[PDB]
Symmetry: D2
């Protein structure tokens, strides 16, 4: 039916899908650590059910549950995985008003300062499969260096398919110091029709960057579509690198998970800021996606199927012998309720793990500190 660029050009709002990888980990099919997708062949019914839950939630994009392979004889079964995945994706995408998207991300074999040629071959190696499976469009995501991302877009444009590029960096800028605005520019110039940011930072942060990007493009005449797919984790204490530096990553993030109301707020802000491809990254479960779609329903003209088992703002609580519980079926109540953590012995924030060791500072100052205390004790 309608392609990515068409939808956007028609003024439509493209609902993205959520955090596939994390959802499967909690369901028992993906192992935190390597975070690989071999379940697409080991447990297809699981991968399928998830894609369907997102589709039901209103998601318009089924991102392939793929991964870069080549892992060694000297080749890969990982390729069968990737293909099985694209297929499952396509199957579910076909079941609804959705497209399939192939993705590629930050290459370790780059952070070894290899070369644009070598690294770029990777992106092409993956592009192949996406070509063969005839994906609807491509997405370069999970990037902290425009430098590289720019390469990906370039490598992908080869396909002649629409290209979307988000980055996993917030406020400040990328790792080399490049500000968000510059990024967007460079990225669109490199051919990205859709640009934005994904994962690494929570909803609020993520939209701060978008504004900046938005700015950069405006102050350069370049025009493109805005995209955001943030964490569903509240990360106000995120110092840098993303929530990965947070002590709780990735087994104690439970409490930071956003509520449906949190997501609606974000979706509203996003839309009002101009973002038109609104999705989510790690942490986004099906109901989170459903929150985006319900919040913008008035604008889109419809409710996703999943809303069948839902209500406006607690409405399904109209009924219920208890008055105080029925009194919660109101937008005003949920939109303002400061929910409790349930953990009075825990802080509300944590210092990142950064350990970008200054150096002997973790020695000298420490030593100097130790000595100062003793000299001090002496004067006593």
């Amino acid at each position: 039916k309608r392609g990515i660029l068409e939808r956007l050009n028609a003024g439509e709002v493209v609902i993205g899908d959520g955090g596939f990888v994390f959802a499967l980990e909690k369901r028992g099919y993906v192992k935190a650590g390597p975070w690989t997708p071999e379940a697409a062949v080991e447990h297809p019914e699981a991968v399928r059910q998830l894609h369907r839950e997102f589709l039901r939630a209103g998601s318009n994009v089924m991102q392939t549950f793929t991964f870069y392979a080549s892992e060694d004889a000297e080749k890969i079964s990982g390729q069968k995985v990737n293909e099985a995945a694209c297929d499952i994706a396509r199957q579910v995408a076909d079941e609804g008003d959705a497209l399939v998207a192939g993705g590629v991300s930050q290459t370790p074999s780059y952070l070894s300062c290899k070369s644009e040629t070598e690294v770029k071959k990777i992106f092409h190696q993956q592009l192949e499969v996406f070509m063969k499976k005839n994906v609807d469009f491509l997405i370069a995501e999970y990037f902290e260096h425009v430098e590289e991302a720019v390469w990906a877009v370039e490598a992908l444009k080869t396909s002649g398919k629409p290209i979307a590029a988000t980055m996993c960096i917030g406020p400040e800028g990328d790792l080399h110091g490049v500000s968000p605005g510059e990024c967007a520019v460079r990225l669109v110039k490199a051919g990205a029709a859709i640009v934005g940011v994904n994962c690494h930072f929570d909803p609020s942060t993520s939209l701060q960057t978008i504004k900046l990007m938005k700015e950069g493009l405006e102050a350069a005449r370049l025009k493109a579509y805005l995209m955001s797919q943030p964490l569903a984790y509240h990360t106000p204490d995120c110092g840098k690198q993303g929530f990965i530096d947070l002590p709780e990553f990735p087994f104690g993030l439970e409490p930071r998970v956003a509520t449906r109301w949190d997501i609606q707020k974000y979706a509203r802000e996003a839309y009002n800021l101009g973002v038109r491809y609104i999705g989510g990254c790690c942490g986004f479960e099906p109901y989170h996606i459903r929150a985006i779609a319900e919040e913008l329903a008035p604008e889109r003209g419809f409710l996703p199927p999943a809303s069948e088992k839902h209500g406006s703002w607690g409405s399904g609580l109209d009924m219920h012998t208890k008055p105080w519980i029925r009194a919660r079926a109101r937008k005003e109540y949920w939109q303002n309720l400061r929910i409790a953590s349930g953990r009075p012995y825990n802080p509300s924030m944590s210092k990142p793990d950064a350990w970008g060791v200054t150096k002997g500072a973790a020695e000298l100052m420490q030593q100097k500190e130790a000595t100062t205390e003793q000299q001090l004790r002496a004067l006593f």
Copy 2:
């Protein structure tokens, strides 16, 4: 092959399943408010996938995704079937359940109310369920009736309740409950839902006591909330302001569950599961913690590790340094919401009669008299 009572008698640890209803709500198949299971026929593949995820997590019980019908009967049947199918795929049994009824509260008489339990029992009889479970009771009075009604089947009966350490809505302490419940024929007794892990085990101790101080003997069962509810006044987390759309933050971590599972086991509980909030990985936490004792790891552990182990690898040193039990067992995880409190006062309405009001007048007057002195 092995039945519920056999497993327990063999010294085995029966891993229960989790919070089916809540999980489907987040997945988009159960509407909050009515909380009904019509998806067993509208979207069987969904119900099936969940039962399988729990089974994969190490769960030994597939509780029927049934309910009480005013058809809804086809629903119930379709559910039991799906349950049985998945149960058959692994080392698990199917269990039929019944709970508190609106009619009890509409003081409807032991006869009338008891008919309900029998109406549901029928289906469970017809779909050869391995055993029965009377859960979700705030009044032993009624629960006792359920057990009685169910014993009719001659199948093993487990009765859990949602009551804190202070007894039920009739003042009956936990110990008394357990007694009355086992005397009524429950071979397995314990507490389910309405109270987080820690609390839930406080009651068990009490129940344990009551049975011990009465010579009655039975098997202990617990299936708590996966929600930290230290601010729960009384009448479960349902009275909490955040119920049921803002509980996110209180969700337990796998480490929280392991701790609980360990305490539970050490306290003597042998049927350890979970209620609302329990997702597949939570069940997997129970099974992994007691793996040494049980002799095996559930399949789901294939995509897991001991205590963060899968983090051994990872170019980052500080992240690799997290692959340790000591690290996760002691880490005080942050809420990520610095503008929110860590606790909330329940909603549970008590007064507005004489009090309440004056809890406004005398205060108003005091302020004025005070202002006067100035």
Copy 3:
């Protein structure tokens, strides 16, 4: 003028003084650990100024800044300073005695009782307005103190730093009050080791015990000004933050007013404070019960009702704070987002040896666990 018993019998509300010892520690005249009063002779002007600040705050009692000892000169210099300030206003002087190792390593009833008499002497020689056997946990001993003090024929008020649970020997609050009044205490209550809210829970119990025994007496409370919801059983002393990191738990004037109101409504007629109570805290008690007492303490001269002094102020939002409703309901912030709101007490609950046998079973479980993963994962 009016004696202790008279005041109470006239229906009057006796405002107690605050946490002398802690206030002088923060001012630099008392050292924590020994917490002795040798400043009464080393820096009398300091001790004097404090007694005066409380007196100005509305306090009706100047408790001697005495100790257990030259230490005797100290004690005498203290009583004198007390008397001098007490004389400057509508206040009485009170001599106190508390739980000391005479009972610790168990020095009988004879030996221990001699102590109380040794201190009583000085109090007799200064003709204090009344006696207070405070800071107690074992009624057993407290009962001895009251007995030893009755010897003086002066009124005896009694207070124990104990919870809604019961004395250290295990006897419930009600029993305590009974035993204490029977032993001759005309005034009974609890002081220290627990925050406002808790402290009043016990009073209710005590109140009960006396009522359910026909015994009649006056109720007294002098709690901590520290919020201690996480207090386990042996006072805030077992709390990790004792005594150098209690800052955040300090009560606000509004907190104190609330307490004073509850206390009064419950029947307490001798309302004061212990550790943590600064002058303005005392002033909060007196202002809250002002309507009832008929007057405001002098210190109110530099104060206002409920933020009233904020009427003025070019800023509207700041002027909008000059209201009881605003301060009585404002959930003040901690300002420490990286800190928990509660802490587990320290009291090694004698596991002994298990504190080292359980920590074994855990170690072993982890290894056995690690073992299973090794086997099962290395074979599909």
Copy 4:
């Protein structure tokens, strides 16, 4: 005998005094109304005891408990300076006269008029022989610069500090620029004070330090921050915070907090380290003890103290004795004791409007209704 500039030039560390006004408010001598010093004559013994507690704590400066106004106020000011001088004389300390942001400027009252004020106050300070002058509380370099200028008239050393963080001053006059302009205007000592907790306060200093360095101008660094943790200071000082000024209790710093700050301050180059609102005597004592090794002595107040909980060595309880360690107190995340309260609060300021505010609610209201609409339609299918 040693003057302010001498001390600093000798490499010495000048310990400032604390939050006099707030301390007297809690003690019952300063009304939270307009915060005036009439107690210097109504209750001298109180003012005296405080100055002495700071002096005992190691403070080297007794700032006059003065105030800008006929109102029986000049006698007040004089009585204050005297009390100050008396206590200053009792130890190794100097007296300092201060002036701050005044209502004039905020009503736009010509540099001439406003400047007269500073001179009116200067007079008294001249007459009582204050050792040096201080321009604290300044939210506009523009004005502060005027103060310094007005004060240089005295030929006495001039110290500058302001209540405005890294964002810079109201006029977008970044911290660096401020320091520059301030020293150029004659300030020998520059820094920040009031309305920014320890951590923040030192962030600005670094900036100022920078500005001066990148301009060859040289001067002495000074900081006297709040003893209140204000991570939520949305913008304006803690005055915009909901809890100001009667619910700040919980944010109060601990002695350990202060030591940390004092250490950072010193390491950053600050040599005049004091405190503003919230600083009690023991807070000052924390600064002095932390830098004791460097200074060569402990203030008298340390007589009733210990290194890091040392006084806990004794105590029948093992777990309590185990707390007599720097490592324990320096790392202990102290609890708030208020599980029903948040750890942060949004400041009070106000986005005027007439647009999407009287409307934010409108579009929101309408969206909810349209949303509600869609729900009815589909549950009919």
